[PDB]
Design an enzyme around this catalytic site. Sequence first.
Site, PDB file in Angstrom:
ATOM      1  N   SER A  42       0.796  -1.234   0.000  1.00  0.00           N
ATOM      2  CA  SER A  42       0.000   0.000   0.000  1.00  0.00           C
ATOM      3  C   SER A  42       0.826   1.281   0.000  1.00  0.00           C
ATOM      4  CB  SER A  42      -0.985   0.042   1.175  1.00  0.00           C
ATOM      5  OG  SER A  42      -2.168  -0.709   0.888  1.00  0.00           O
ATOM      6  N   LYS A 206       2.988   6.758   4.423  1.00  0.00           N
ATOM      7  CA  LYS A 206       2.036   5.759   3.944  1.00  0.00           C
ATOM      8  C   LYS A 206       2.624   4.378   4.188  1.00  0.00           C
ATOM      9  CE  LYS A 206      -1.611   3.978   2.321  1.00  0.00           C
ATOM     10  NZ  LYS A 206      -1.293   2.995   3.404  1.00  0.00           N
ATOM     11  N   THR A 207       1.913   3.577   4.974  1.00  0.00           N
ATOM     12  CA  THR A 207       2.277   2.207   5.293  1.00  0.00           C
ATOM     13  C   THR A 207       1.824   1.242   4.192  1.00  0.00           C
ATOM     14  OG1 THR A 207       0.343   2.366   6.742  1.00  0.00           O
ATOM     15  CG2 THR A 207       2.487   2.303   7.804  1.00  0.00           C
ATOM     16  N   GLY A 208       2.377   0.033   4.228  1.00  0.00           N
ATOM     17  CA  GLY A 208       1.886  -1.047   3.393  1.00  0.00           C
ATOM     18  C   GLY A 208       2.179  -2.385   4.030  1.00  0.00           C
TER      19      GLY A 208
END
Length: 261
Positions: A42, A206-208
Amino acid sequence: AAPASFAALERAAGGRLGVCAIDTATGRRALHRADERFPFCSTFKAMLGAAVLAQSVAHPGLLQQRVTYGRSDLVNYSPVTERHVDTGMTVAELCAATIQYSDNTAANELMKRIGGPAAVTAYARSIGDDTFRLDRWETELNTALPGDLRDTTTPAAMAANLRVLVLGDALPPAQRAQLIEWLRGNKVGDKAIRAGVPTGWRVGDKTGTGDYGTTNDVGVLWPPSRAPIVLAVYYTQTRADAKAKDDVIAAATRIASATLA
Protein backbone atom coordinates in the site's frame (compact mmCIF):
# COMPACT_ATOMS: atom_id res chain seq x y z
CA ALA A 1 21.02 -5.59 22.78
CA ALA A 2 18.83 -4.23 19.99
CA PRO A 3 20.54 -4.46 16.58
CA ALA A 4 22.51 -1.29 15.90
CA SER A 5 22.82 -1.38 12.09
CA PHE A 6 20.53 -2.17 9.18
CA ALA A 7 22.61 -5.26 8.43
CA ALA A 8 22.37 -6.46 12.04
CA LEU A 9 18.61 -5.84 12.09
CA GLU A 10 18.17 -7.81 8.87
CA ARG A 11 20.17 -10.70 10.35
CA ALA A 12 18.18 -10.60 13.61
CA ALA A 13 14.77 -10.38 11.94
CA GLY A 14 15.46 -12.66 8.98
CA GLY A 15 14.18 -11.74 5.55
CA ARG A 16 15.21 -8.79 3.40
CA LEU A 17 15.31 -5.15 4.54
CA GLY A 18 15.52 -2.09 2.31
CA VAL A 19 16.10 1.45 3.61
CA CYS A 20 16.74 4.82 1.99
CA ALA A 21 16.91 7.78 4.37
CA ILE A 22 17.93 11.25 3.15
CA ASP A 23 18.86 14.24 5.31
CA THR A 24 17.60 17.02 3.04
CA ALA A 25 19.95 19.60 4.62
CA THR A 26 23.27 17.77 4.25
CA GLY A 27 22.43 15.12 1.66
CA ARG A 28 23.79 12.42 3.95
CA ARG A 29 22.02 9.10 3.55
CA ALA A 30 21.36 5.94 5.52
CA LEU A 31 21.12 3.04 3.08
CA HIS A 32 20.54 -0.69 2.99
CA ARG A 33 19.63 -2.51 -0.26
CA ALA A 34 18.39 0.90 -1.39
CA ASP A 35 18.54 -0.06 -5.08
CA GLU A 36 16.87 -3.48 -4.74
CA ARG A 37 13.25 -4.02 -5.74
CA PHE A 38 10.65 -4.73 -3.06
CA PRO A 39 6.89 -5.36 -3.31
CA PHE A 40 5.58 -1.93 -2.39
CA CYS A 41 2.05 -2.95 -1.28
CA SER A 42 0.00 0.00 0.00
CA THR A 43 2.89 2.48 -0.11
CA PHE A 44 1.89 2.97 -3.76
CA LYS A 45 -1.20 4.83 -2.57
CA ALA A 46 1.06 7.84 -1.96
CA MET A 47 1.82 7.78 -5.70
CA LEU A 48 -1.83 7.18 -6.55
CA GLY A 49 -2.85 10.25 -4.55
CA ALA A 50 -0.13 12.27 -6.26
CA ALA A 51 -1.31 11.05 -9.69
CA VAL A 52 -4.91 12.06 -8.95
CA LEU A 53 -3.78 15.48 -7.75
CA ALA A 54 -1.64 15.91 -10.87
CA GLN A 55 -4.62 15.18 -13.12
CA SER A 56 -6.60 17.73 -11.09
CA VAL A 57 -4.31 20.53 -12.31
CA ALA A 58 -5.73 20.41 -15.84
CA HIS A 59 -9.16 19.22 -14.59
CA PRO A 60 -9.83 21.17 -11.37
CA GLY A 61 -13.27 19.57 -11.04
CA LEU A 62 -11.78 16.10 -10.65
CA LEU A 63 -11.61 16.02 -6.84
CA GLN A 64 -15.32 16.93 -6.62
CA GLN A 65 -16.51 14.20 -8.99
CA ARG A 66 -18.80 11.66 -7.33
CA VAL A 67 -17.94 7.97 -7.80
CA THR A 68 -20.69 5.40 -7.32
CA TYR A 69 -19.73 1.76 -6.78
CA GLY A 70 -21.58 -1.40 -5.76
CA ARG A 71 -21.33 -4.22 -3.24
CA SER A 72 -19.50 -6.39 -5.77
CA ASP A 73 -16.85 -3.69 -6.21
CA LEU A 74 -15.82 -4.02 -2.56
CA VAL A 75 -12.53 -5.81 -1.93
CA ASN A 76 -11.05 -6.93 1.38
CA TYR A 77 -10.28 -4.14 3.89
CA SER A 78 -12.55 -1.28 2.81
CA PRO A 79 -13.38 0.36 6.16
CA VAL A 80 -14.54 3.69 4.67
CA THR A 81 -15.91 2.75 1.25
CA GLU A 82 -18.05 -0.06 2.67
CA ARG A 83 -20.04 2.64 4.51
CA HIS A 84 -20.91 4.55 1.32
CA VAL A 85 -22.11 1.96 -1.20
CA ASP A 86 -25.47 3.74 -1.40
CA THR A 87 -24.25 7.37 -1.47
CA GLY A 88 -20.99 7.16 -3.41
CA MET A 89 -17.93 9.23 -2.53
CA THR A 90 -16.08 12.10 -4.14
CA VAL A 91 -12.64 11.58 -5.65
CA ALA A 92 -11.17 13.69 -2.82
CA GLU A 93 -12.96 11.55 -0.23
CA LEU A 94 -11.57 8.42 -1.89
CA CYS A 95 -8.04 9.87 -1.80
CA ALA A 96 -8.38 10.62 1.91
CA ALA A 97 -9.73 7.13 2.60
CA THR A 98 -7.00 5.35 0.68
CA ILE A 99 -4.08 7.38 2.13
CA GLN A 100 -5.31 7.82 5.72
CA TYR A 101 -6.89 4.39 6.24
CA SER A 102 -5.34 2.41 3.33
CA ASP A 103 -8.87 1.66 2.08
CA ASN A 104 -8.52 -0.85 -0.76
CA THR A 105 -11.74 -0.29 -2.74
CA ALA A 106 -10.96 3.43 -2.63
CA ALA A 107 -7.67 2.78 -4.44
CA ASN A 108 -9.34 0.61 -7.08
CA GLU A 109 -12.07 3.19 -7.67
CA LEU A 110 -9.51 5.98 -8.05
CA MET A 111 -7.54 3.86 -10.50
CA LYS A 112 -10.66 3.13 -12.55
CA ARG A 113 -11.23 6.87 -12.82
CA ILE A 114 -7.71 7.89 -13.87
CA GLY A 115 -6.60 5.02 -16.10
CA GLY A 116 -5.58 2.07 -13.97
CA PRO A 117 -2.17 0.70 -12.97
CA ALA A 118 -0.70 1.97 -16.24
CA ALA A 119 -1.71 5.54 -15.37
CA VAL A 120 0.03 5.42 -11.98
CA THR A 121 3.15 4.00 -13.61
CA ALA A 122 3.04 6.72 -16.28
CA TYR A 123 2.75 9.35 -13.56
CA ALA A 124 5.82 7.89 -11.82
CA ARG A 125 7.77 8.18 -15.08
CA SER A 126 6.64 11.81 -15.35
CA ILE A 127 8.40 12.73 -12.09
CA GLY A 128 11.63 10.93 -13.04
CA ASP A 129 10.94 7.48 -11.54
CA ASP A 130 11.97 4.86 -14.12
CA THR A 131 11.86 2.07 -11.50
CA PHE A 132 8.32 2.00 -10.07
CA ARG A 133 5.92 -0.39 -11.77
CA LEU A 134 2.27 -0.86 -10.80
CA ASP A 135 0.79 -3.87 -12.57
CA ARG A 136 -2.23 -5.17 -10.65
CA TRP A 137 -5.17 -3.94 -8.53
CA GLU A 138 -6.14 -4.40 -4.89
CA THR A 139 -5.68 -6.77 -3.30
CA GLU A 140 -3.76 -8.97 -5.76
CA LEU A 141 -0.92 -6.43 -5.99
CA ASN A 142 0.10 -7.45 -2.43
CA THR A 143 1.03 -11.08 -3.23
CA ALA A 144 4.69 -10.08 -2.68
CA LEU A 145 6.05 -13.22 -4.32
CA PRO A 146 9.82 -13.65 -3.90
CA GLY A 147 11.62 -12.41 -7.02
CA ASP A 148 8.45 -11.17 -8.74
CA LEU A 149 8.97 -7.83 -10.50
CA ARG A 150 5.27 -6.94 -10.53
CA ASP A 151 4.17 -4.11 -8.23
CA THR A 152 7.70 -3.28 -7.05
CA THR A 153 9.99 -0.32 -6.59
CA THR A 154 13.23 0.44 -4.77
CA PRO A 155 13.62 2.32 -1.48
CA ALA A 156 15.79 4.92 -3.25
CA ALA A 157 13.25 5.51 -6.04
CA MET A 158 10.36 5.99 -3.61
CA ALA A 159 12.43 8.26 -1.38
CA ALA A 160 13.30 10.41 -4.40
CA ASN A 161 9.60 10.62 -5.27
CA LEU A 162 8.64 11.72 -1.76
CA ARG A 163 11.37 14.35 -1.79
CA VAL A 164 10.24 16.00 -5.02
CA LEU A 165 6.53 15.56 -4.21
CA VAL A 166 6.56 16.82 -0.62
CA LEU A 167 9.56 19.16 -0.60
CA GLY A 168 10.00 19.96 -4.30
CA ASP A 169 7.92 21.39 -7.14
CA ALA A 170 6.47 18.22 -8.72
CA LEU A 171 2.97 19.42 -7.74
CA PRO A 172 1.64 23.01 -7.64
CA PRO A 173 1.44 24.46 -4.11
CA ALA A 174 -2.24 23.69 -3.45
CA GLN A 175 -1.93 20.05 -4.53
CA ARG A 176 1.40 19.72 -2.71
CA ALA A 177 -0.25 20.95 0.48
CA GLN A 178 -3.08 18.45 0.00
CA LEU A 179 -0.76 15.48 -0.43
CA ILE A 180 1.15 16.48 2.72
CA GLU A 181 -2.12 16.80 4.64
CA TRP A 182 -3.23 13.30 3.64
CA LEU A 183 0.17 11.77 4.51
CA ARG A 184 0.28 13.53 7.89
CA GLY A 185 -3.15 12.03 8.57
CA ASN A 186 -2.19 8.33 8.36
CA LYS A 187 -4.30 6.60 11.02
CA VAL A 188 -3.10 3.03 10.54
CA GLY A 189 0.67 3.35 10.95
CA ASP A 190 1.16 4.08 14.65
CA LYS A 191 3.52 1.12 15.17
CA ALA A 192 5.74 1.81 12.14
CA ILE A 193 7.87 4.90 11.40
CA ARG A 194 5.83 6.86 13.96
CA ALA A 195 6.92 4.49 16.74
CA GLY A 196 10.60 4.89 15.85
CA VAL A 197 11.07 8.66 15.70
CA PRO A 198 11.90 10.78 18.77
CA THR A 199 9.02 12.60 20.41
CA GLY A 200 8.31 16.00 18.90
CA TRP A 201 9.04 14.84 15.35
CA ARG A 202 6.19 15.24 12.86
CA VAL A 203 5.51 12.48 10.33
CA GLY A 204 3.70 12.18 7.04
CA ASP A 205 3.74 8.63 5.74
CA LYS A 206 2.04 5.76 3.94
CA THR A 207 2.28 2.21 5.29
CA GLY A 208 1.89 -1.05 3.39
CA THR A 209 1.50 -4.73 4.23
CA GLY A 210 1.29 -7.85 2.15
CA ASP A 211 1.90 -11.57 1.89
CA TYR A 212 5.28 -13.12 2.77
CA GLY A 213 5.13 -11.06 5.95
CA THR A 214 5.76 -7.83 4.05
CA THR A 215 5.65 -4.58 6.03
CA ASN A 216 6.61 -1.22 4.50
CA ASP A 217 6.40 2.47 5.37
CA VAL A 218 7.52 5.56 3.43
CA GLY A 219 7.29 9.20 4.36
CA VAL A 220 8.81 12.49 5.43
CA LEU A 221 9.97 13.29 8.97
CA TRP A 222 10.19 16.82 10.38
CA PRO A 223 12.47 17.14 13.43
CA PRO A 224 11.83 20.24 15.57
CA SER A 225 14.90 22.36 14.69
CA ARG A 226 16.32 20.58 11.64
CA ALA A 227 15.61 20.05 7.96
CA PRO A 228 13.23 17.17 7.16
CA ILE A 229 14.38 13.61 6.56
CA VAL A 230 12.91 11.47 3.77
CA LEU A 231 12.58 7.83 4.80
CA ALA A 232 11.59 4.75 2.81
CA VAL A 233 11.52 1.35 4.54
CA TYR A 234 10.62 -1.92 2.83
CA TYR A 235 10.73 -5.33 4.48
CA THR A 236 9.73 -8.77 3.23
CA GLN A 237 10.28 -12.36 4.36
CA THR A 238 11.10 -15.70 2.78
CA ARG A 239 8.14 -17.94 3.67
CA ALA A 240 4.53 -17.60 2.61
CA ASP A 241 3.53 -18.42 6.21
CA ALA A 242 5.61 -15.52 7.58
CA LYS A 243 3.90 -13.21 10.04
CA ALA A 244 4.16 -9.44 9.89
CA LYS A 245 6.79 -8.07 12.25
CA ASP A 246 5.16 -4.88 13.54
CA ASP A 247 8.40 -3.56 15.10
CA VAL A 248 11.01 -3.95 12.34
CA ILE A 249 10.12 -0.66 10.62
CA ALA A 250 10.30 1.25 13.91
CA ALA A 251 13.68 -0.36 14.63
CA ALA A 252 14.98 0.62 11.18
CA THR A 253 13.67 4.16 11.76
CA ARG A 254 15.67 4.43 14.99
CA ILE A 255 18.82 3.32 13.14
CA ALA A 256 18.23 5.77 10.29
CA SER A 257 17.60 8.61 12.75
CA ALA A 258 20.79 7.79 14.67
CA THR A 259 22.89 7.71 11.50
CA LEU A 260 21.50 11.11 10.45
CA ALA A 261 21.64 12.74 13.91
